Amino acid sequence: SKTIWLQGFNSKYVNSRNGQGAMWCDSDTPQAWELFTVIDAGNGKIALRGNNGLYVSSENGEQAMTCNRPAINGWEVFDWISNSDGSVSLRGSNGMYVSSENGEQAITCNRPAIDGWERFNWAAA
Ligand SMILES: OC[C@H]1O[C@@H](O)[C@H](O)[C@@H](O)[C@@H]1O
Ligand SMILES: OC[C@H]1O[C@@H](O)[C@H](O)[C@@H](O)[C@@H]1O
Ligand SMILES: OC[C@H]1O[C@@H](O)[C@H](O)[C@@H](O)[C@@H]1O
């Protein structure tokens, strides 16, 4: 039921970009576009509903990640990985990890391992 924000390796916050184009980890402070409702999608999987009421997609790693899907299936469910330092990682349905890409390009879900860029600090809004 909880609304959260996600802070990437570069200290900026994950931004839905209002469903226009790709998501970026580029905002200074968490505001409306940086808030995501965590959705229990069944069997330990989660989805994320953005400010626009649409759902985050891995895009199967074929393009940068987006927040424009009107319904959850799948590319829209993720494993919520709880890391030892209290950070979170997200694993898409293709087995790859959501990456802030250090804010140098739009967010992706095509990297097979958790490194610095794939670990997010988070908090309930
Ligand atoms: O306040 C709503 C949104 O406005 C946009 O102009 C900013 O880029 C977002 O970071 C913010 O969440
Ligand atoms: O379409 C596949 C997906 O559909 C969703 O409605 C389920 O909750 C997911 O766990 C499933 O992988
Ligand atoms: O059905 C698997 C996936 O197919 C894609 O074409 C859709 O854009 C995704 O939203 C969906 O989860």
PDB file of C-alpha atoms and ligand atoms in Angstrom:
ATOM      1  CA  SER A   1       0.000   0.000   0.000  1.00  0.00           C
ATOM      2  CA  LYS A   2       3.060   2.180   0.376  1.00  0.00           C
ATOM      3  CA  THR A   3       4.362   5.055  -1.721  1.00  0.00           C
ATOM      4  CA  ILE A   4       8.169   5.183  -1.920  1.00  0.00           C
ATOM      5  CA  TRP A   5      10.976   7.036  -3.626  1.00  0.00           C
ATOM      6  CA  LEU A   6      14.203   5.544  -4.971  1.00  0.00           C
ATOM      7  CA  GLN A   7      17.624   7.232  -4.763  1.00  0.00           C
ATOM      8  CA  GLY A   8      20.281   6.045  -7.193  1.00  0.00           C
ATOM      9  CA  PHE A   9      24.067   5.769  -7.028  1.00  0.00           C
ATOM     10  CA  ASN A  10      24.422   9.396  -8.203  1.00  0.00           C
ATOM     11  CA  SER A  11      22.305  10.697  -5.239  1.00  0.00           C
ATOM     12  CA  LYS A  12      19.437  11.723  -7.551  1.00  0.00           C
ATOM     13  CA  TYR A  13      15.951  10.201  -7.410  1.00  0.00           C
ATOM     14  CA  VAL A  14      14.217   7.945  -9.929  1.00  0.00           C
ATOM     15  CA  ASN A  15      11.837   9.958 -12.104  1.00  0.00           C
ATOM     16  CA  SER A  16       8.838   8.589 -13.999  1.00  0.00           C
ATOM     17  CA  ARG A  17       9.164  11.541 -16.419  1.00  0.00           C
ATOM     18  CA  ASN A  18       5.334  11.481 -16.357  1.00  0.00           C
ATOM     19  CA  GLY A  19       5.274   8.581 -18.822  1.00  0.00           C
ATOM     20  CA  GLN A  20       6.769  10.728 -21.601  1.00  0.00           C
ATOM     21  CA  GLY A  21       9.774   8.930 -23.030  1.00  0.00           C
ATOM     22  CA  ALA A  22      12.119   7.024 -20.733  1.00  0.00           C
ATOM     23  CA  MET A  23      12.593   7.095 -16.966  1.00  0.00           C
ATOM     24  CA  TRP A  24      15.722   8.814 -15.627  1.00  0.00           C
ATOM     25  CA  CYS A  25      17.515   8.877 -12.277  1.00  0.00           C
ATOM     26  CA  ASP A  26      17.907  12.636 -12.488  1.00  0.00           C
ATOM     27  CA  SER A  27      15.793  14.566  -9.947  1.00  0.00           C
ATOM     28  CA  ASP A  28      17.305  16.542  -7.082  1.00  0.00           C
ATOM     29  CA  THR A  29      14.512  15.944  -4.544  1.00  0.00           C
ATOM     30  CA  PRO A  30      11.601  13.455  -4.540  1.00  0.00           C
ATOM     31  CA  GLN A  31       8.385  15.108  -5.709  1.00  0.00           C
ATOM     32  CA  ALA A  32       5.261  13.772  -7.433  1.00  0.00           C
ATOM     33  CA  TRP A  33       7.065  12.180 -10.388  1.00  0.00           C
ATOM     34  CA  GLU A  34       9.549  10.499  -8.019  1.00  0.00           C
ATOM     35  CA  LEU A  35       6.858   8.678  -6.001  1.00  0.00           C
ATOM     36  CA  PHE A  36       5.883   5.092  -6.826  1.00  0.00           C
ATOM     37  CA  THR A  37       3.210   2.940  -5.212  1.00  0.00           C
ATOM     38  CA  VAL A  38       4.573  -0.530  -4.496  1.00  0.00           C
ATOM     39  CA  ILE A  39       2.082  -3.128  -5.712  1.00  0.00           C
ATOM     40  CA  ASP A  40       1.932  -6.673  -4.361  1.00  0.00           C
ATOM     41  CA  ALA A  41       1.619  -8.569  -7.652  1.00  0.00           C
ATOM     42  CA  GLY A  42       1.539 -12.070  -6.150  1.00  0.00           C
ATOM     43  CA  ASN A  43       4.173 -14.717  -5.351  1.00  0.00           C
ATOM     44  CA  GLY A  44       6.696 -12.221  -3.997  1.00  0.00           C
ATOM     45  CA  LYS A  45       6.675  -9.998  -7.088  1.00  0.00           C
ATOM     46  CA  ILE A  46       6.071  -6.249  -7.018  1.00  0.00           C
ATOM     47  CA  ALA A  47       4.957  -3.679  -9.563  1.00  0.00           C
ATOM     48  CA  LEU A  48       5.342   0.094  -9.363  1.00  0.00           C
ATOM     49  CA  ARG A  49       2.547   2.571 -10.138  1.00  0.00           C
ATOM     50  CA  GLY A  50       3.851   6.037 -11.017  1.00  0.00           C
ATOM     51  CA  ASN A  51       2.405   9.519 -10.582  1.00  0.00           C
ATOM     52  CA  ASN A  52       0.328   9.101 -13.758  1.00  0.00           C
ATOM     53  CA  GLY A  53      -1.381   5.924 -12.542  1.00  0.00           C
ATOM     54  CA  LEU A  54       0.563   3.834 -15.075  1.00  0.00           C
ATOM     55  CA  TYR A  55       3.028   1.033 -14.394  1.00  0.00           C
ATOM     56  CA  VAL A  56       6.815   0.780 -14.661  1.00  0.00           C
ATOM     57  CA  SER A  57       8.068  -1.615 -17.367  1.00  0.00           C
ATOM     58  CA  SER A  58      11.450  -3.297 -17.795  1.00  0.00           C
ATOM     59  CA  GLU A  59      10.820  -3.066 -21.578  1.00  0.00           C
ATOM     60  CA  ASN A  60      12.570  -6.474 -21.577  1.00  0.00           C
ATOM     61  CA  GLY A  61      15.812  -4.503 -21.828  1.00  0.00           C
ATOM     62  CA  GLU A  62      15.012  -3.678 -25.483  1.00  0.00           C
ATOM     63  CA  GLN A  63      14.872   0.064 -24.727  1.00  0.00           C
ATOM     64  CA  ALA A  64      15.264   2.297 -21.693  1.00  0.00           C
ATOM     65  CA  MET A  65      12.680   1.684 -18.964  1.00  0.00           C
ATOM     66  CA  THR A  66       9.325   3.499 -19.049  1.00  0.00           C
ATOM     67  CA  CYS A  67       6.332   4.321 -16.830  1.00  0.00           C
ATOM     68  CA  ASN A  68       3.439   4.235 -19.297  1.00  0.00           C
ATOM     69  CA  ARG A  69       1.738   0.818 -19.144  1.00  0.00           C
ATOM     70  CA  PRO A  70      -2.029   0.899 -18.451  1.00  0.00           C
ATOM     71  CA  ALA A  71      -1.937  -2.595 -16.916  1.00  0.00           C
ATOM     72  CA  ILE A  72       0.487  -4.930 -15.149  1.00  0.00           C
ATOM     73  CA  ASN A  73       1.782  -8.069 -16.911  1.00  0.00           C
ATOM     74  CA  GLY A  74       4.916  -9.844 -17.631  1.00  0.00           C
ATOM     75  CA  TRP A  75       7.490  -7.072 -18.067  1.00  0.00           C
ATOM     76  CA  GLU A  76       5.887  -5.031 -15.259  1.00  0.00           C
ATOM     77  CA  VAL A  77       6.711  -7.272 -12.258  1.00  0.00           C
ATOM     78  CA  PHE A  78       9.999  -7.262 -10.349  1.00  0.00           C
ATOM     79  CA  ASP A  79      11.838  -9.144  -7.638  1.00  0.00           C
ATOM     80  CA  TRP A  80      12.455  -6.848  -4.676  1.00  0.00           C
ATOM     81  CA  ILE A  81      15.964  -7.734  -3.484  1.00  0.00           C
ATOM     82  CA  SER A  82      16.833  -6.546   0.017  1.00  0.00           C
ATOM     83  CA  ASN A  83      20.578  -5.864   0.172  1.00  0.00           C
ATOM     84  CA  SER A  84      22.654  -6.070   3.344  1.00  0.00           C
ATOM     85  CA  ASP A  85      23.260  -2.308   3.564  1.00  0.00           C
ATOM     86  CA  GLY A  86      19.504  -1.597   3.616  1.00  0.00           C
ATOM     87  CA  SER A  87      19.403  -0.689  -0.079  1.00  0.00           C
ATOM     88  CA  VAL A  88      17.127  -2.281  -2.674  1.00  0.00           C
ATOM     89  CA  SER A  89      17.705  -3.790  -6.093  1.00  0.00           C
ATOM     90  CA  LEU A  90      14.985  -4.716  -8.612  1.00  0.00           C
ATOM     91  CA  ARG A  91      15.196  -7.689 -10.969  1.00  0.00           C
ATOM     92  CA  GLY A  92      13.026  -7.616 -14.092  1.00  0.00           C
ATOM     93  CA  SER A  93      11.339 -10.607 -15.679  1.00  0.00           C
ATOM     94  CA  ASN A  94      14.273 -11.089 -18.092  1.00  0.00           C
ATOM     95  CA  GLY A  95      16.562 -11.735 -15.112  1.00  0.00           C
ATOM     96  CA  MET A  96      18.328  -8.374 -15.469  1.00  0.00           C
ATOM     97  CA  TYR A  97      18.641  -5.603 -12.887  1.00  0.00           C
ATOM     98  CA  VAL A  98      17.239  -2.070 -12.923  1.00  0.00           C
ATOM     99  CA  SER A  99      20.175   0.326 -13.329  1.00  0.00           C
ATOM    100  CA  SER A 100      20.362   4.034 -12.600  1.00  0.00           C
ATOM    101  CA  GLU A 101      23.169   4.114 -15.199  1.00  0.00           C
ATOM    102  CA  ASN A 102      24.630   6.743 -12.814  1.00  0.00           C
ATOM    103  CA  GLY A 103      22.270   9.247 -14.453  1.00  0.00           C
ATOM    104  CA  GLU A 104      24.390   9.252 -17.632  1.00  0.00           C
ATOM    105  CA  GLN A 105      21.648   7.701 -19.789  1.00  0.00           C
ATOM    106  CA  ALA A 106      18.026   6.747 -19.213  1.00  0.00           C
ATOM    107  CA  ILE A 107      17.332   3.938 -16.734  1.00  0.00           C
ATOM    108  CA  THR A 108      17.778   0.404 -18.093  1.00  0.00           C
ATOM    109  CA  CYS A 109      16.986  -3.193 -17.184  1.00  0.00           C
ATOM    110  CA  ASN A 110      19.643  -5.100 -19.131  1.00  0.00           C
ATOM    111  CA  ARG A 111      22.588  -5.625 -16.702  1.00  0.00           C
ATOM    112  CA  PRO A 112      22.993  -9.191 -15.337  1.00  0.00           C
ATOM    113  CA  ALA A 113      24.605  -8.252 -12.002  1.00  0.00           C
ATOM    114  CA  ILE A 114      24.039  -5.893  -9.081  1.00  0.00           C
ATOM    115  CA  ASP A 115      26.763  -3.239  -8.857  1.00  0.00           C
ATOM    116  CA  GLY A 116      26.762   0.320  -7.523  1.00  0.00           C
ATOM    117  CA  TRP A 117      24.372   1.615 -10.187  1.00  0.00           C
ATOM    118  CA  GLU A 118      21.789  -1.129  -9.507  1.00  0.00           C
ATOM    119  CA  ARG A 119      21.434  -0.401  -5.784  1.00  0.00           C
ATOM    120  CA  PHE A 120      18.913   2.176  -4.603  1.00  0.00           C
ATOM    121  CA  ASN A 121      18.241   3.760  -1.263  1.00  0.00           C
ATOM    122  CA  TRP A 122      14.520   3.940  -0.584  1.00  0.00           C
ATOM    123  CA  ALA A 123      11.996   5.193   1.927  1.00  0.00           C
ATOM    124  CA  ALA A 124       8.249   5.359   2.336  1.00  0.00           C
ATOM    125  CA  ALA A 125       7.003   8.803   1.305  1.00  0.00           C
TER     126      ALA A 125
HETATM  127  O1  LIG B   1       6.293  18.224  -9.242  1.00  0.00           O
HETATM  128  C1  LIG B   1       6.085  17.272 -10.289  1.00  0.00           C
HETATM  129  C2  LIG B   1       7.341  17.095 -11.148  1.00  0.00           C
HETATM  130  O2  LIG B   1       7.646  18.301 -11.846  1.00  0.00           O
HETATM  131  C3  LIG B   1       8.673  18.135 -12.831  1.00  0.00           C
HETATM  132  O3  LIG B   1       8.899  19.385 -13.484  1.00  0.00           O
HETATM  133  C4  LIG B   1       9.966  17.629 -12.188  1.00  0.00           C
HETATM  134  O4  LIG B   1      10.958  17.362 -13.185  1.00  0.00           O
HETATM  135  C5  LIG B   1       9.695  16.364 -11.379  1.00  0.00           C
HETATM  136  O5  LIG B   1      10.889  15.929 -10.710  1.00  0.00           O
HETATM  137  C6  LIG B   1       8.580  16.631 -10.380  1.00  0.00           C
HETATM  138  O6  LIG B   1       8.297  15.423  -9.676  1.00  0.00           O
HETATM  139  O1  LIG B   2       1.362 -11.598 -17.151  1.00  0.00           O
HETATM  140  C1  LIG B   2       2.314 -12.172 -16.246  1.00  0.00           C
HETATM  141  C2  LIG B   2       2.236 -11.430 -14.919  1.00  0.00           C
HETATM  142  O2  LIG B   2       0.871 -11.050 -14.684  1.00  0.00           O
HETATM  143  C3  LIG B   2       0.630 -10.399 -13.431  1.00  0.00           C
HETATM  144  O3  LIG B   2      -0.760 -10.052 -13.336  1.00  0.00           O
HETATM  145  C4  LIG B   2       1.099 -11.302 -12.289  1.00  0.00           C
HETATM  146  O4  LIG B   2       0.772 -10.749 -11.008  1.00  0.00           O
HETATM  147  C5  LIG B   2       2.599 -11.517 -12.465  1.00  0.00           C
HETATM  148  O5  LIG B   2       3.196 -12.204 -11.359  1.00  0.00           O
HETATM  149  C6  LIG B   2       2.783 -12.281 -13.775  1.00  0.00           C
HETATM  150  O6  LIG B   2       4.160 -12.593 -14.020  1.00  0.00           O
HETATM  151  O1  LIG B   3       3.278  -9.777 -22.418  1.00  0.00           O
HETATM  152  C1  LIG B   3       4.656  -9.491 -22.151  1.00  0.00           C
HETATM  153  C2  LIG B   3       4.915  -8.020 -22.453  1.00  0.00           C
HETATM  154  O2  LIG B   3       4.605  -7.794 -23.826  1.00  0.00           O
HETATM  155  C3  LIG B   3       4.957  -6.482 -24.274  1.00  0.00           C
HETATM  156  O3  LIG B   3       4.647  -6.358 -25.665  1.00  0.00           O
HETATM  157  C4  LIG B   3       4.190  -5.438 -23.464  1.00  0.00           C
HETATM  158  O4  LIG B   3       4.588  -4.124 -23.866  1.00  0.00           O
HETATM  159  C5  LIG B   3       4.477  -5.636 -21.982  1.00  0.00           C
HETATM  160  O5  LIG B   3       3.768  -4.662 -21.209  1.00  0.00           O
HETATM  161  C6  LIG B   3       4.098  -7.058 -21.586  1.00  0.00           C
HETATM  162  O6  LIG B   3       4.353  -7.269 -20.189  1.00  0.00           O
END
